[model samples]
Target: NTPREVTLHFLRTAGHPLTRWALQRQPPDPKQLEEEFLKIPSNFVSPEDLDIPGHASKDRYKTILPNPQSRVCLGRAQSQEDGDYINANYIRGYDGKEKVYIATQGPMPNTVSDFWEMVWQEEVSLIVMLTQCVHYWPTEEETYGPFQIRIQDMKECPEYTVRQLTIQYQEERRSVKHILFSAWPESAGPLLRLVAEVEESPETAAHPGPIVVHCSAGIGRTGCFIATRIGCQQLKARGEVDILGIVCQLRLDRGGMIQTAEQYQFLHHTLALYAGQLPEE
Candidate 1:
């Protein structure tokens, strides 16, 4: 969809009432938005809920277990006989579309195979990694269980690096694109560009599985990316944006998305910039 066209339509028609209010009448105030952000409780899952015996240890501080109903279950294969588990969830896309994303914690050396297993089983074509490797862990060149992943090419940008990976599972092969954004802080220019690239890619659009998005804990920056992408679509398609509604929906799928008031404010700022870019009717 053309942003210019979609935006013009909204401007002329005076889209959804909330959308109009957000864009024109009463744009969010950073201080007030922060206060509202604090009021929303962090409905995190209990550690006991994610305590799986004989599995790799997940960082208690970061990993939030997915709700049982929407959790991504690993396939029972020869390598993963016990049915591997990871701290991940299937987050719905804009308009509540299912399988839009597989949000998970950054991969640890012990849990790398489980992560790869998720990519393979889910048939994910793109992985958006929001953080860099802090501690030494498995590199992309290493093999994980039945799959071997190697970097075919890498393109570096000021804000992120894009890698083309070739994955092999004996006779089967798949190409996956990985985008890594190391910066912890948010900038509308870089983030919006990255989001547009991912959203508009033909490969991403063709992929059957959800795009895998992860950060250190898979909630804070991860949630910001998902919410922004969905919000952009709602604005373009329906001429409406529901920042609060989107965040609430995400919390229902997996707790603690958009981890801080600062991040929340950044999201609103990003959307505001995008909305401002639209051509006037």
Candidate 2:
């Protein structure tokens, strides 16, 4: 069956569709959603089902931590004039900031070509690209540049980045960070690692604010990363946490956030592992 069929079937069976309230009037029931999701035909059981020794959950409602360092911005694409506050601005605010990095799951859109050109001309310190989709990187003759590309082999990527790195929506969950990290290790890894590092380390950098992360619609991968960061942090801060509650906040603020139940489960698992906690309920 096609992804659409799969999604519709899940939605019909699910009391709530795994989309933002903004995208739908009512959120799907997590319990029903999980049950329907299990009905999906799969020869290879998902890792989420294979109980992690320490963190396995018998109940559907599980808890996780929230990463306070991370911030979630919800909106459509806009120009720099709109405000540099938002991380995943569709319009490229290319100027300012040295050692800048962008985490986007899909290829750059045509609408933002102008912003990209401006970035190229302005000569920003650096640009690092990461995505689970699209095997081919766009050519310099194309849009971005003769950008150096790296691929993630599961063995080499950082443990945190790998924990919940599953890809959905017809894409494989390869190491987007690993590919970028390998190519620009000195420049990219340190910066990206800093975000992960701050999640644990006491020492503070000059509060660079939030890191920009986005998937095609700024929901699935975007939500997964942000939720993982947030959930992980909360788990560390508090003894336990509510992932659905956190994701609900994300979806309320940002449309297209957390598109599927499985994606939601993955986010919780990622955060749980990141925070050094056990997995699900």
Candidate 3:
């Protein structure tokens, strides 16, 4: 009998005592017997094909390209000792002279103070803190904002700035955007929108300094947010954004940016959404 038929025959008859005794005279291949049986087709339609809805413009958003020269920082952190500061990595020089340094979230008590120290030492004109809370350091020396996205559940957020974004969370992924807010979290969209607005304000527009974004390790979600904003700005000006390219640029400046799987997925979805593609499952 052929291999297929032999196996089928044994499977059909092996339960019977007499058949088992007869089959004992000619045992099957030991390796074959040890093999497990699982159902895995070479090219089968995935469950998502039936369950997940597809968008007609699914591939259209793949057009977001990255402009290499439009940023001072991408995915990495800048240090004081490292003198290699550039526009697309860290240290945005205004009027082609004064440099601005971006600080990651530092240790407690010193988180805000350390950042202020860097600002003072570097003689930075403005500071942008993109962490969850605005209460990092004491700034008695100068007046700085403790800005919060209203949706972040922070009471300190200004009343005038609250915007909406679409959010979607599924078994595969979770994505939030200003264009369409998902049922998963209505609050987060407003918060992100507020943050984005802060980045687009007149003060920020005029100053154009390095912004800080830190949540725990300064990677993953924070990286996605920062990368998305920078990518979107570049894409808006030039009609393209490359997340991997941005990540690479940032990594060259500082290591361990976009170091999580979730962050990578977020970057991909964020770019895709901004490019006007479907962000659903």
Candidate 4:
């Protein structure tokens, strides 16, 4: 059975969906939320599950690995072997579309090329970097393996910056937006604004693809951003959300997502404040 997480968000809201969600009426207290979040199982793929000996060099953290079932592969065969593995996983979006987003570890020095390969191969246009941790940032132009990244333009904002980049794998070039949010790594205010910024922008997907999200280990903050995005969508449309289900599905996709009880609570409050941004009708 598909997880209820995917199915429930789209179902019609019977009551005043806004008031039903704008406030969980009496949303769970922080401590109760902590206990509830803790109950969700952390389903992860251990090192033993990966037969490839070379993946260790690519993974940012030894313990934080992608779930085998949902892992994103770079190669065409859909096999993890043959230099295809990149510590990343496919996460579903609010409307239950699979592969709408990818949660990935920050690119290690040796794996930056692999990271670019994944971006090019996946045709990913939007990259939400929850942390500044990265191998490199191109000023004008830089080439990683066959993939070349050139900064077409950039706009700076208080909480984040958006860089419009053109990526070339061969003779073909495509545009990408790298949104870097380095402010208040642990705060919820700017995070909500970033969510709005992304949502308002017209998408530039060269193909229907996932938005790549990474934050150091790609679980904690990455999970929060993705959950916030989906939760915002559900709350805006149907006037409700399921943080537990969202977090659970994320972990099932990549493991150890929404890494702490605090982050989980932040999502709830972020969504709540975002509710204030919604219409009163």
Candidate 5:
């Protein structure tokens, strides 16, 4: 019965040419993969295309637009005021589960409050920062309207530093784990470790909220991290994976994800290493 049902299900799904093609494909050759990765830049929509009125300068580059369908909207505190917008987008998880990540650029000086506003509104519990592109934090205790954020603890690792932050608003208080990776080089081990921490957190794992991920421009290293997490989940579930398909889906949600060919190749390499480490089922 099992074999019969499996064969029938495969046959039925085979009617869709794309699925049939995807199911039979193997990982691409390194040289060919580079070629494919190189082709994606041209296919991406310009970031300027989605720029909000008066907020164009907030973007580091004109080519990193957030997709309108998934962009996060910030409503005004008072009904008489206009709403504010950020360049962040809601990224889907493996198999399109919602609210898995909020991808955005590193905060600019002017947009710092907007960034915290996002964290408060989204109820985010973890923030993964992938760069030191610019210094935006103030030395003084900063308050953004009703929300106030302050660093509570700090720990240094070989590749990154971890900070425990406290946010207070009205009678509500929340703790957020913030990780800052100074750089991204050949080895993505530190990043893998950080992501593992986030995945293993009891609160985040049980009732997942949007985990904020950012880089200098919020697409290059940021995309790499998000893609790796999703790819790892796919590998664990089906014992197979599609890095290309995952990346394409991400870009559909927010353009310029996995920004460079090198980053794309690195993702595949990281997934290969991760899959090798997974124990036998």
Candidate 6:
């Protein structure tokens, strides 16, 4: 019940290694792996905790809320005094650079406007939508209040669909690339390719904003995507990866990240393959 203190105690112990070397060579048992993953404090927060008014309407799930400290704030994009809340958080990259990615909930029918307002204000260029979330735009165009979205072009990649779109506000327009994953199959081929695609996108050259990632609740699948991105970067930077520290950092940013023990194991499975791609020392 007290996951907060319990997870803290676990992190404070000596058994948890920082880098990926000590364990990657001899992959930890799945059962033990999950135990360690669950030990990290969720640091669960709530709309009530922050005293945000009408917060429930904005969240896809009342159970999942962005960490107040790390949550993104909305400006007057909607032209209101209280347009300062969005269920999204700023996530750091491998080197701990802030705004590397934004983990958020799938836009509810009503929050679609807020979602685009976020992209416009944040200068985001890449949006990755996963799970069963609805596509917010038509093939042609749709207007969401101040944000006008147009599907400039769309292409079907191997396991995902790339929708090249634009968001215009007050006559200022910007093009954004959106990736809607077909599904998360048992294979990692698509996921790895996605990591490559986003990092290599021309958008990075324009000094783009965070890569917005979302699923249903914005934690489980979203965390997996972000965790894999950072882990792979860490692996390449150093010869090792830090699965423990990565998940912990994610949870710190958005509570309930990597929500299930099964999800943690899936990450472990994915990282193993990536590590295997390299030669044994």
lDDT of each: 0.74, 0.36, 0.34, 0.77, 0.71, 0.79
For candidate 3, write residues 136-196 as lDDT tens digits. Answer: 4322222222211112121234423122211111222111111111221213344345445
TM-score of each: 0.84, 0.39, 0.43, 0.87, 0.82, 0.90
Please give the clash total of every predicted structure, in order.
0, 15, 16, 0, 3, 1
State the local distance difference test value for candidate 4: 0.77
Best by TM-score: 6
In model 3, where do residues sit more than 4 Å from their true spots?
1-103, 110-112, 123-134, 138-195, 204-208, 277-281
Give per-residue lDDT, candidate 5, residue 267.
Answer: 78
Query: What does candidate 4's lDDT look like per residue over 1-281, in tens digits?
Result: 56444333322221112244435557878897888777676665678977866888778788888877788877743223367778899998886689999999888777787787788788887888876455455899887766788888999898899999888866788888889897745557898889878877666765777999988898888888998898888888876776666676676677788778888788788888888778877
Ranking by TM-score: 6, 4, 1, 5, 3, 2
Candidate numbers sorted by lDDT from highest down: 6, 4, 1, 5, 2, 3
Q: Show the colliding residue pairs in model 5.
A: 47-63, 47-64, 47-65
* Residue pairs in collision within model 6: 20-241
Kindly report which residue stretches of model 5 are placed more than 4 angstroms away from their true locations once superposed: 1-27, 41-51, 78-82, 136-140, 204-207
**Candidate 1 vs 4: which has more lDDT:** 4
Off by over 4 Å in 4: 1-25, 76-82, 185-187
Report model 6's TM-score to 2 decimal places: 0.90
Model 1 Cα lDDT, one tens digit per residue, 97-158 = 99989888877766677777888888888889887434222354777777788878888888
Write candidate 2's Cα lDDT for 1-281 as tens digits. 99645643543343221222212234345675476445432211233543333221211112221111232222323333232222233211112222222333333333243233223222322223324334233322232232223322333344233211211112311212222322212222343353454344331122332243443444455555555555544555554455545554453233345666776555544443444433444
